[PDB]
Amino acid sequence: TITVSTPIKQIFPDDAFAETIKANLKKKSVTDAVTQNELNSIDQIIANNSDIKSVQGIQYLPNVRYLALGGNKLHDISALKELTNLGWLNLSNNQLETLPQGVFEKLTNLTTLNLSNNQLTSLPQGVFERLASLTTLNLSNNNLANLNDKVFEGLTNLTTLNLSNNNLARLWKHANPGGPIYFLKGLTNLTTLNLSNNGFDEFPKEVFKDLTSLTTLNLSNNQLTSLPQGVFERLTNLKTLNLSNNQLQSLPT
Numbered sequence: 001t002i003t004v005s006t007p008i009k010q011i012f013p014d015d016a017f018a019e020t021i022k023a024n025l026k027k028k029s030v031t032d033a034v035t036q037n038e039l040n041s042i043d044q045i046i047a048n049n050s051d052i053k054s055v056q057g058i059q060y061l062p063n064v065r066y067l068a069l070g071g072n073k074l075h076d077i078s079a080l081k082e083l084t085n086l087g088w089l090n091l092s093n094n095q096l097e098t099l100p101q102g103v104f105e106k107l108t109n110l111t112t113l114n115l116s117n118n119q120l121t122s123l124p125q126g127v128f129e130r131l132a133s134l135t136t137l138n139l140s141n142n143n144l145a146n147l148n149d150k151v152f153e154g155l156t157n158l159t160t161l162n163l164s165n166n167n168l169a170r171l172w173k174h175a176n177p178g179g180p181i182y183f184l185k186g187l188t189n190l191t192t193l194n195l196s197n198n199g200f201d202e203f204p205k206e207v208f209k210d211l212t213s214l215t216t217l218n219l220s221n222n223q224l225t226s227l228p229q230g231v232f233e234r235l236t237n238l239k240t241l242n243l244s245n246n247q248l249q250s251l252p253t
Helices: 015-025 038-042
Strands: 044-046 066-068 087-088 113-116 137-139 160-162 192-194 216-218 241-244
Touching: 015 044
Parallel strands: 044 066, 066 087, 087 113, 113 137, 137 160, 160 192, 192 216, 216 241
Antiparallel strands: none
């Protein structure tokens, strides 16, 4: 919140981002003063591939609902902590190495979250615990190699989950310290799941035990040598199953 007319360049230190705000407010200069009212009028920002290094100042746009910041150079996103009306957030192709604890604790109206093509390697504890209106989550093309058991707990309305091109193979090996990690518990409404390109070479039967609404499963480009029995019996709504580029041989006898 601002209480007097203030220059845009002042609130929004980053040049690229300042110009963005300028354009959306239809101001001639980035030094033009603006009122909290004018900032309240902004309900979306679409700024892909805009070279934005920081979204500092975005704290003052309380009514943003649709935010597209893909293809920028964002390393920090803590300034979104309080945009509680956010419904769509695309942070793909940035340079996020990590997320703040509780950065999404408040974004309870969020329905789409795209974190793809970053360099995330792990996720904080309770990173998506509040997001109960979330339906789409894209974490593909990161370096995810570790997930906590309760990571996707409370995404009860999640319908699409994309985890391609990561490094989760280890999470599904009996020889894994603490056994396999059942990170898909309770995704009763999930319908599309993409686990391609993770070096999977085995997977227990219990992993997909809750995915009853599942219709599309991509396991292509992994290192699977065989599949277990009982999986298809559970996934009664499964229509598309991609197993290409694996090593499925007929069991040796």
